[model samples]
Target: VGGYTCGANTVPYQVSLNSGYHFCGGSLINSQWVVSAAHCYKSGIQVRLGEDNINVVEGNEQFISASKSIVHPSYNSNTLNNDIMLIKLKSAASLNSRVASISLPTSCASAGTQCLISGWGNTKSSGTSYPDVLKCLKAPILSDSSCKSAYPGQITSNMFCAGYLEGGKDSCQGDSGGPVVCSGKLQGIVSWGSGCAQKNKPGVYTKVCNYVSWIKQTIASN
Candidate 1:
């Protein structure tokens, strides 16, 4: 949101929900696994990989139906705690230049670390203004103190904050379930926010570093 188009194949790990009508974004973490937000859960979700534009029939795209959708058991809709979900592809994606996986976080990101948030979410905070092509923005991770102050009791350890405090940069609606990559690691998943790019209110994301074990164990068992 509020970013320029991410050229084709540049964001190989990025995935669009549905075919021609993308409703959300996701991150490909492995051959068959995708990390996304729980709030974006829906039936018969179609994962489009190597997608550049939603309107164009890009030759690079590969569509896969979800075999399973697993939301965190502790996920709370009201407070948005544990807003993480995993999607298992019905078939493993064929890796190529235009389709690949992003590595899960090795460690937590510190405050001020720059990260890329990419999605096909709404451009404006109000009304509809979605983009045909994927969009990306580089924002800095905010400290827990600042995050807690911004959202009060809503900021949990499972969540972290990012974007500009001065406003004009953020992950808006429809960007939920998208990736937030820092230092080449999938550090976060777009979860929530007060408003898009508003002063004092930053974009909140599911802290991926805290869910590494859960992700791996779940993948292994399922």
Candidate 2:
């Protein structure tokens, strides 16, 4: 409900994942690496860098294919746990005004921290509209207890929830695997939820810093 148009390159690291189509959102962790949600994993992953709009190529667009896609070994679809993935771009991206990388947070965002969630997802539930422009909204991080009360035993340590408990705002379909940044640092990777912006249900994401070790190891090996 709180979908708002975002400025061009306000989040310079923001990028779209074209897995045959624009199905998920992601970000450039560096010139050669991109991070997203594992449930969004697909064969033809390409990073659309320097894009403020998904439809138009925005001149600065630099599309790069993933040389290697690594999903966490313990990811579980049944429980929706450990939903994270790393894509190693075949070629390094050239840093520019509209294309850049974001620094990863060293730790988790504290409860109540206002985090920015951005993507070109549907505006409403089951909505076909994939707006041309990029959008973002600030969602405050909710405590594990608060999330657990709403989700009931589904909130794992590997994930965190963000959004208004009373509803009115959230990341919906086509927004999966998007960046959830806190204080300019990547703190989460959009994972899943019961439905788009439903009352009491918050958007869940893979807790990033929790698996920073794996991310570092994966990038080095690739």
Candidate 3:
């Protein structure tokens, strides 16, 4: 995706996952629960809230350790299917103008549906350095059939694709598990991609619409 610094309070639900250093991104769905990619929690995970500029700690920043973590039972490392994870904060995040939860999709997104994605991912794929501020971009959802054609039998029903067919708009490294908002709803999760942005290779994400039940159940149970 063509990354640009987002305006203040534009994407209030974004969370930064730091393990001594910033690594992955997550979305605040509620005060207590945060959704992210399963691969984000290989080490101790700390959540940073209410941050826009990563250069300084803001008053709204809420840092908390995870009280619990649960990865989807069927997560496949090879295919990156069912690649979601949830973290229950030891304490709830303080609500404010700069911090809030993102809304989940009541339905699935269709082909060519315009959506927005946000992250602090690398500015360039060749480097590991992230931006000083959060970045957001718009990408159009690709139909499952079209996504399949791009991945060639690898894209599964649990996942969907969004980005440009000609490339240049996508989520890259450190963006995993960030928000994929479509029609003002959380429609996708930054899961994996073949490359940063290449011809015919759009960003692949965990289709949030397909896991509404699982998310509800997980939240209810824990």
Ranked candidates (TM-score, high to low): 1, 2, 3
For residues 1-222, what per-residue lDDT tens digits would candidate 1 score against the true structure?
Answer: 357666777989999888346888999999999989999899889999998777788799899999899999899999888999999999999999989999988799999999999988465632233377678889999999999999886888899999887776776687888999999999999998888646678899999999999999999999
Per-residue lDDT of candidate 2, residues 133-214 (tens digit): 7788888999998888988868888988888877668776768888999998999988888666567788888899898888
The residue-by-residue lDDT of candidate 3 on 36-147, one tens digit each, is: 9987766588898887766687556789988888999998888898999988999988888889988888888889899889888554632333475788888888888878
> What TM-score do all the candidates reach, one by one?
0.94, 0.94, 0.93
Off by over 4 Å in 3: 123-130
Q: Against the unseen true structure, what C-alpha lDDT does each candidate score?
A: 0.86, 0.83, 0.83
Best by lDDT: 1
Model 2 Cα displacement at 141 (Å)? 0.5
The alpha-carbon deviation from the true structure for residue 30 of candidate 3, after best TM-score superposition, in angstroms, is 0.8
Any residue pairs clashing in model 3, and if so which? 1-169, 1-170
Weakest lDDT window of 10 consecutive positions for candidate 2:
121-130
